Amino acid sequence: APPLVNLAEEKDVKVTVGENMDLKNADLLTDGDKYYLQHDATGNKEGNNWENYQEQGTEVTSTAEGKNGVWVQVDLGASYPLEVINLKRQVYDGQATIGNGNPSGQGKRLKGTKISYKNTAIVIGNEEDLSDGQIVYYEGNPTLPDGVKQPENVSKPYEEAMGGQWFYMDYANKNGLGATELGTTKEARYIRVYTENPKGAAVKFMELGIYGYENEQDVQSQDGPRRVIDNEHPMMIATAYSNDVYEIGQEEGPELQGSNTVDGRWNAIPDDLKENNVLLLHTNNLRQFAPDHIGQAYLQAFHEHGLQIAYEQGAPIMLLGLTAAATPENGGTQYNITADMDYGWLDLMYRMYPNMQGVFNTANFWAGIHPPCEGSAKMLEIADRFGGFFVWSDQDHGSTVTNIVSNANMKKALEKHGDAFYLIYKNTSSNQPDDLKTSSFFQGSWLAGYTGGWGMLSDTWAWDKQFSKLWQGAGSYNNWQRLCGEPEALLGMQMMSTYLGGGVIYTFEFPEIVYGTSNTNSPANTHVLTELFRYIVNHPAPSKKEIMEETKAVLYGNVSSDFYSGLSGKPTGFQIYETGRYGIIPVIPTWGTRAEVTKKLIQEADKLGVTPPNVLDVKDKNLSGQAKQKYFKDLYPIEYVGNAFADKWEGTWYLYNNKVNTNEKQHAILPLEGEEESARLKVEMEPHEFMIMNESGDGTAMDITLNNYRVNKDEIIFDNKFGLTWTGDFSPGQTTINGKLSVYKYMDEYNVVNAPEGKLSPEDNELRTTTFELTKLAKEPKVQVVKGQQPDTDGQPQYTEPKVEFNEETGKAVITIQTNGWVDLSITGLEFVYDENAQKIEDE
Ligand SMILES: CC(=O)N[C@@H]1[C@@H](O)[C@H](O[C@@H]2O[C@H](CO)[C@H](O)[C@H](O[C@H]3O[C@H](CO)[C@H](O)[C@H](O)[C@H]3NC(C)=O)[C@H]2O[C@@H]2O[C@@H](C)[C@@H](O)[C@@H](O)[C@@H]2O)[C@@H](CO)O[C@H]1O
Ligand SMILES: CC(=O)N[C@@H]1[C@@H](O)[C@H](O[C@@H]2O[C@H](CO)[C@H](O)[C@H](O[C@H]3O[C@H](CO)[C@H](O)[C@H](O)[C@H]3NC(C)=O)[C@H]2O[C@@H]2O[C@@H](C)[C@@H](O)[C@@H](O)[C@@H]2O)[C@@H](CO)O[C@H]1O
Ligand SMILES: [Ca+2]
Ligand SMILES: [Mg+2]
């Protein structure tokens, strides 16, 4: 029970009207129903047809000749601090037709004649006759109570809307229509609404919501940001997709994909990671294509129910604000019930639910550009007003940011609210090599100060575009099979590369694979995401200052996808690098001209007390095919030798094998700390492995964490040994397509961490070799397993004990270990001696 309530619903209200007015169905004014849906139990269809919009409400009819104006008054029974009023009257003159929307033949929109009421006013006070009345809203010339002055500024009529109209307690803020700071209240017992129907003596009041507090003590206040998102406070987002089943009034919380629940997903998060996690409520295909009355009812009911369950658990929430250009803005689609968003309702969710933090936008521009920018500009302002945030997820082929800023309203909203705005990549279209350019754009936007930060959405749909079985191409498998195919450790490699670039947001799909089903944690979540995210929570990423200090070159403009080849790495579609030598290579998109972006970057650098990096156009002669390698190699000295990825950040080495689906060993030769500069570690790894190494500093010891967790899908998914149905079709009496049910069944029965009787432990028992060669040493060093991933219930080990071989002649120690999972090693008793033959750390 949060402190802001609908007092009109909560209290035993009394409804009255004036002299020469008749009142019918007073109870409907405060019943919490704006839509009067009748077929919730059958998906809001009568047979195969969406239910018609039937407007019910409190009818007030003037019986005075020559005076069609009426009023209705609610007595809350006592005085309460009021913050928001929601007024809805009959929207349509006659009936709405369920008409064609966008796309044609699929999307439904109401069409008909909307009413523009006139002589509307809202007056509140503590006297039953409102002799002490305070004007909340005033349009036209309705006669106010004796003692109440006319306002100097009077409003003009508006068109009645599906969600009603929203009023606040500051008459100076757009004549009462302007959203106030949290906790802006006026005390009142009595709320009177004047209205004249342009046609006739009767007004139908569908709903009057009166939001306020039990007492002054409960009144809320804006107390800085709801969340900090930065290197010291990173954020993991998990998508909570509706399973597309919901009935207004249901007692149980909204069902999510894969038998998950909002509270169940929250309680699955390890306690020490909960403060760095959020849940994203996603309407998915819930009431997809529905006309306005059904779409808005379900968008609100689904999100409110989720928010309430999250509030009880202390779980912070983001809502999906916009996908597939499904916005109420002119030209929007109805691909999602986000098409029925009421900005006044979104404002109310921030006031009502202190755990409401953010809005998410993804995958719009395929379906339209300007309408989703118009919507995003409004929702970014709302989020920032309440100290919340806005996350935009997309891959940038070159036009994504340019499109965002091509919209005048979105450009202006970013100028004012940019610190609450975050861009994260989205590698779904892994076959288009824009992964590395997107990271550059999003890092550059943050670095120059256009945005609050950047991060990642790694999507296992990326596997589907290229690969199936381990080491193999996509072949002719069903896409739902290929979705299950991605190596778990590869998600950690992506998380490590985003971390090293000062990324602060981490998200993964498909959620039922990467996070889990049935309110359990998946193998990916248990053995990779929670393990590395804990590291990232406890070891801050580079700050903006730390990235700016280490950045020698910032690029401007539409960088070529393949620019990264010969520098940081060939774009794979999987958001990983061949080397950390050059970092991400920030590229500022066309937020402004090159000169404008340069002034912005210099001001940002100056605020941080750092030398501004040089800004080069992507077309600069230094950045040509033939010149870029010498140019970058001269700016950034080599830190290690080899074809594996390595980067040294804050005295720690970060490595991985960078082969996505080719079985090749790679190595990194690292110059080691301590008095003996000739000291070397050669690490050699097979694919799907990342490593964190932290030297004692004096040359005697090092700690190494490696993680190469990988489940084998070849037999259970691709050979389909359990005969799952992998198709995009529905079976009779199912609301979910067979391929998706097959993903859930795989995660529920065949791929279970700590598998109970009758379920299968993960196929993760085939081990792979890591070797460490240390030169040149006086004697054999000591290696031990400080801690290692333990068996599943099948009792099979995830690692073997490390073996050490020391050649006393060459002074080379070789440490060998076999793993599938994580191990923490400690190497001690190192005595390095001068090695005239040590690998030189220099370019070829
Ligand atoms: C032109 C183009 O291709 N546009 C891109 C879309 O195709 C992307 O949509 C996703 O496509 C997936 C296949 O690659 C898949 O169909 C997915 O829907 C299915 O999976 C999601 C989870 O990822 C949900 O479980 C859905 O319910 C499920 N569909 C069904 C019918 O069961 C698509 O993604 C969803 O739809 C888009 C529009 C967004 O709302 C996403 O957040 C959804 O998850 C799209 C996503 O990256 O990118 C476009 O550019
Ligand atoms: C008595 C007898 O012959 N024992 C058998 C073992 O030798 C088998 O182990 C595999 O042997 C292969 C050579 O004959 C090979 O070394 C293989 O490891 C290599 O391939 C795996 C494939 O994933 C990994 O890539 C390893 O990293 C790679 N090794 C190197 C040095 O690059 C061996 O399999 C591994 O080692 C065994 C002991 C187990 O730990 C497996 O989980 C590992 O994959 C063994 C399996 O075929 O069968 C015995 O009967
Ligand atoms: Ca195992
Ligand atoms: Mg009602």
Numbering used by the authors: 49 to 892
From the paper:
We showed by HPAEC-PAD and LC-FD-MS/MS that RgGH98 is specific for blood group A tetrasaccharide type II (BgA II). As expected from the construct, RgGH98 adopts a modular structure with 3 domains. Structural alignment to homologous GH98 enzymes identified the binding pocket and the general acid catalytic residue as Glu 411, which is present in a cleft in the centre of the Cd. Fragmentation of this species showed that the deoxy-hexose was linked to the hexose at the reducing end, as determined by the characteristic fragments at 431 and 449 Da. Together, the HPAEC-PAD and MS/MS analyses confirmed that BgAtri was released from mucin following RgGH98 hydrolysis of the Galβ1-4GlcNAc glycosidic linkage in BgA II.
We generated an RgGH98 E411A mutant and obtained a complex with the unprocessed carbohydrate following incubation of RgGH98 E411A crystals with BgA II (GalNAcα1–3[Fucα1–2]Galβ1-4GlcNAc). We showed that RgGH98 specificity for BgA is achieved through the precise positioning of amino acid side chains around the BgA GalNAc moiety, as shown in the crystal structure of the complex between RgGH98 E411A and BgA II, principally through Gln 305, Trp 528, and Lys 788. When the complexes with BgAtri (trisaccharide) and BgA II (tetrasaccharide) were overlaid, the GlcNAc residue was found to be very close to Glu 411 at <2 Å in the tetrasaccharide complex. The GlcNAc spatial arrangement is in contrast to the Sp3GH98 complex, in which the GlcNAc residue is pivoted with respect to Gal. It is proposed that Glu 411 adopts a different rotamer in the presence of substrate. As well as bringing the side chain into a position from which a steric clash is avoided, this shift also provides a change in local environment, which may alter residue’s pKa, promoting catalysis. Density for an additional BgA II tetrasaccharide was observed at the C-term domain. Interactions are primarily with the terminal GalNAc of BgA II, specifically with Lys713, Glu734, Glu814, Arg816, Thr817. In the RgGH98 E411A-BgA II complex, 2 metal ions were modelled. The first, a magnesium ion, in the GBLD N-term, coordinated by the side chains of Asp 79, Tyr 84, and Glu 255 and the backbone carbonyls of Leu 76 and Met 254. The second, a calcium ion, in the C-term domain, coordinated by Asp 812, Asn 813, and Gln 846, with additional water models filling the octahedral geometry.
